[PDB]
Amino acid sequence: KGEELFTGVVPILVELDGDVNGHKFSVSGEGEGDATYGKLTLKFICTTGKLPVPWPTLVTTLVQCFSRYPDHMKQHDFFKSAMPEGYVQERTISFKDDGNYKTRAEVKFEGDTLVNRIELKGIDFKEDGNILGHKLEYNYNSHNVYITADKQKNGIKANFKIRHNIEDGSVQLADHYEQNTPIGDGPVLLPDNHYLSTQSALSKDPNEKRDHMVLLEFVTAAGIT
Numbered sequence: 001k002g003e004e005l006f007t008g009v010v011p012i013l014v015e016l017d018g019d020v021n022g023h024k025f026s027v028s029g030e031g032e033g034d035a036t037y038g039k040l041t042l043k044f045i046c047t048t049g050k051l052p053v054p055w056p057t058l059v060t061t062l063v064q065c066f067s068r069y070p071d072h073m074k075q076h077d078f079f080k081s082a083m084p085e086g087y088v089q090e091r092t093i094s095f096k097d098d099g100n101y102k103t104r105a106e107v108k109f110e111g112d113t114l115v116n117r118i119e120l121k122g123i124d125f126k127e128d129g130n131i132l133g134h135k136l137e138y139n140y141n142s143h144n145v146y147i148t149a150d151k152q153k154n155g156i157k158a159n160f161k162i163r164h165n166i167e168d169g170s171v172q173l174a175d176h177y178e179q180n181t182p183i184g185d186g187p188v189l190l191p192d193n194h195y196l197s198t199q200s201a202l203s204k205d206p207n208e209k210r211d212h213m214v215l216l217e218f219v220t221a222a223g224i225t
């Protein structure tokens with residue numbers, strides 16, 4: 001059972017290749033997760049140079065298997081149940097009045113390391129919109145991820161709205177539609193409706209000259225008593 005793999009600290013690797021309006025870039029992340037406390041600490045680096053989109057727009061793309069599921073909800077934790085073989089996460093992120101990202105990620109163990117391999121494609125971004133114009137503040141509001149089972153696909157879907165803060169006090173909405181499907185043939189947990197409550201703190205490494213993002217995230221399952 002998948003959850004047995006998460007009782008202690010697990011190293012995480014994230015590798016993203018992206019193309020947004022033809023701007024190609026890559027991000028490499030390292031860090032660790034402790035699902036006991038729903039805690040992620042990660043540092044992401046753009047290995048191709050300057051990130052052509054704001055870091056906060058990549059937070060959701062850049063391992064919900066590290067959510068803390070309260071014991072009374074453990075039968076609803078799809079993500080860990082899919083491990084170690086993993087799951088494929090597909091998202092469409094629709095930025096209101098602007099372009100969209102489509103992402104595909106394979107999340108699985110490689111040895112004792114949890115790896116998230118991602119391809120991101122962004123299209124129809126406006127040149128001086130909030131994304132390609134870099135008008136988003138370097139922060140991240142707390143939000144819920146709402147999960148529902150997709151039993152015909154042996155997986156789950158999530159929907160949620162991210163509100164990115166624009167530097168002028170306004171909000172850039174990013175609608176997220178997500179589907180997750182197991183990679184392996186083992187049984188997985190198909191949950192009741194519930195949500196993940198998440199909080200993310202973005203920061204910088206003061207010794208780091210590369211374009212990068214330090215992230216501290218807490219994710220807790222809720223919505224079932």
Ligand SMILES: [Mg+2]
Nearest residue numbers: 165168169170
């Ligand atoms: Mg403000």
